[PDB]
């Protein structure tokens, strides 16, 4: 019943807010820990023989991640007797805190759980998993940007983009594709993190807005497998005719908003020299674009054959409108001549 | 001296050698029993007695019992002993050689009493957490 | 750092490698995870006993709680997977 569901989801919100507030480490590990328990059940609504093992995957990886994290905290304490976030004082510990967080974001090569888990749940729980869960671990990485061992960070940051690419060309059903999209953008967030966190948080905001746009659209059409999406051009042409655009904003074609992340990132890293890395990165982001395009071909640009049975469905308007949606489209697209406002994030 | 705390650490580690190898959960439950009592002993040696008895009570007197329930739900005929497979036993030996290579190489009272008066925040989040954990168990099993 | 701590840390490393070698029915993994939990606990408590950093005497037990708590959750999922098969990771 909704009265319990809402308490769970609110305690997830709390279970992340807690990470964003507390300075003491123990309250952060508590933040993730409470977040987990409240995250699993919401994946289990409706409940499927499939969904169950989805949640098994998610829990199993999040649990081992949280374990390594707490271990590395304890080692940090052993070699500096502190609990405040700040710098860590022992590289053998620090790399593990980086690993634990690397699982929590789902960055490659730790990534393999994310495409699978997404498959196992409905687009509601899916969207929430790909947005809200991406806050907390980043919320702590921004706080430990000061001492990060950049080599280790850029390697996962790149490899997340290659794997976020190649594994994206291959799939049909959309949810797995959304998984590889996100797994690819996280490479771009976590890449620039050692150099300048404000660019990260900018990119984060764009990513969340974007994936809200998509998942609200998939909800609006209840499409899933690519073919299932293909029929929608005749029933409610607008929304396919809008998936095209939001997809291009994923692709970062430059007038569109989604270009704003990359094009600030390239700036920042370029101040650092490091000129080669963004070139490889930006080149691969293309590869990321391509399956957004193919998916666009299944949908709006071209009309796959309709099934007959569709006709009766034409009489019936969609209902239960999702208020927040139109703004999530528009912000995730047209906002490009409002980059400078990014400095609001200081 | 006796090095008794240290040799306890050694029995602890082999407790995880036979435990981390994976030969039917029940025997692993034995592994955590042995490692459990060894654990409480080791922490007892520094005199944080209340804690060692927490783990000797709350953990081993709680957990491994409920695992003594999961196996009733899992089991499968002919569970394997440590000796019952080449990879399992191979693993156990694999732990032994390593750890052997390593060998070849009150304040508490008020300290925890402080939890209530002087640390209400943790009490709040633990209360809330355990509560909604019960709720989660509901919303899975139901 | 005194050798004992090194020994417990190593018990952690085994308590992880055991989780990841990961085989057959997964109930073993919930065990190995709990063992991992216990090693972190002990390694914490020895420290708080060491420096008489008294407030932190509260943490290990609190640590224990949530950690045990998630494991308490974990069995439930296993039930469900056990419910349709008679469990195996395979």
């Amino acid at each position: 019943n909704p009265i319990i569901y809402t308490t769970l989801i609110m305690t997830v919100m709390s279970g992340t807010m807690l990470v964003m507030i507390s300075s003491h480490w123990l309250l952060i590990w508590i933040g993730f820990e409470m977040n987990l328990l409240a995250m699993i059940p919401v994946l289990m609504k409706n409940f499927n023989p499939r969904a169950t093992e989805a949640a098994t995957k998610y829990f199993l990886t999040q649990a081992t991640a949280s374990m390594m994290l707490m271990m590395a905290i304890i080692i940090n304490l052993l070699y500096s007797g502190q609990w405040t976030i700040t710098k860590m004082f022992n590289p053998v510990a620090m790399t593990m805190m980086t690993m634990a967080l690397a699982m929590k974001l789902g960055l490659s090569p730790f990534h393999f759980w994310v495409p699978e888990v997404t498959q196992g749940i409905s687009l509601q729980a899916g969207l929430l998993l790909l947005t809200w869960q991406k806050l907390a671990p980043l919320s702590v990485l921004c706080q430990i940007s000061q001492s990060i061992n950049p080599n280790l960070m850029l390697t996962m940051a790149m490899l997340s983009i290659l794997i976020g690419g190649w594994g994206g060309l291959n799939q049909t059903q959309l949810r797995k594709i959304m998984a590889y999209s996100s797994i690819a953008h996280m490479g771009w967030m976590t890449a620039v993190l050692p150099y300048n966190t404000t660019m990260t948080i900018l990119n984060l905001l764009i990513y969340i807005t974007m994936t809200l746009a998509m998942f609200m659209l998939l909800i609006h059409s209840s499409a899933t497998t690519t073919l299932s999406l293909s029929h929608t051009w005749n029933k409610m042409p607008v929304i396919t005719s809008l998936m095209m655009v939001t997809l291009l904003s994923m692709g970062g074609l430059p007038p569109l908003s989604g270009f704003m992340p990359k094009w600030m990132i390239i700036q920042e890293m370029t101040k650092n020299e490091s000129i080669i890395m963004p070139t490889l990165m930006a080149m691969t982001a293309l590869l990321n674009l391509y399956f957004y395009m193919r998916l666009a071909y299944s949908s709006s640009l071209t009309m796959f054959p309709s099934t007959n049975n569709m006709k009766m469905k034409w009489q019936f308007e969609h209902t239960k409108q999702m208020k927040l949606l139109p703004t999530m489209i528009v912000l995730s697209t047209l906002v490009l001549p409002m980059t400078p406002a990014l400095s609001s994030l200081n | 001296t006796m090095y008794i705390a240290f040799i306890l650490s050694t029995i602890f580690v082999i407790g995880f050698v036979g435990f981390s190898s994976k030969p039917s959960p029940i025997y692993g439950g034995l592994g955590l029993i042995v490692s459990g009592g060894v654990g409480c002993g080791i922490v007892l040696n520094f005199g944080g007695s209340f804690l060692g008895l927490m783990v000797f009570l709350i953990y081993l007197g709680g957990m491994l019992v409920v695992f003594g329930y999961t196996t009733a739900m899992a089991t499968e005929m002919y569970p394997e002993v440590w000796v019952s497979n080449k990879t399992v036993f191979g693993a156990f030996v694999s732990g032994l050689m390593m750890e052997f290579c390593m060998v070849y190489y009150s304040e508490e009272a008020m300290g925890i009493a402080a939890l209530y008066s002087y640390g209400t925040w943790l009490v709040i989040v633990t209360g809330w957490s355990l509560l909604i954990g019960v709720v989660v168990i509901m919303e899975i099993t139901r | 750092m005194p050798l004992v701590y090194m020994n417990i840390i190593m018990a952690f490393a085994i308590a992880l490698a055991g989780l990841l070698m990961y085989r057959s029915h997964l109930m073993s993994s919930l065990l190995c995870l709990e063992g991992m939990m216990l090693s972190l606990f002990i390694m914490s408590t020895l420290i708080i006993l060491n420096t008489h950093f008294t407030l932190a005497n509260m943490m290990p037990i609190i640590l224990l709680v949530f950690a045990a708590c998630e494991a308490a959750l974990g069995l439930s999922l296993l039930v469900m997977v056990s419910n349709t098969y008679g469990t195996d990771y395979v």
């Binding site: 022992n90 053998v92 | 240290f6 190489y105 | 750092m1 005194p2 050798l3 004992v4 090194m6 060491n50």
Partner: peptide
């Protein structure tokens, strides 16, 4: 100990 990071050795009592 050379592994991972140094283990200072000797008996436990010393600390």
């Amino acid at each position: 100990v050379e592994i991972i990071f140094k283990f200072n050795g000797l008996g436990d009592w010393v600390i």
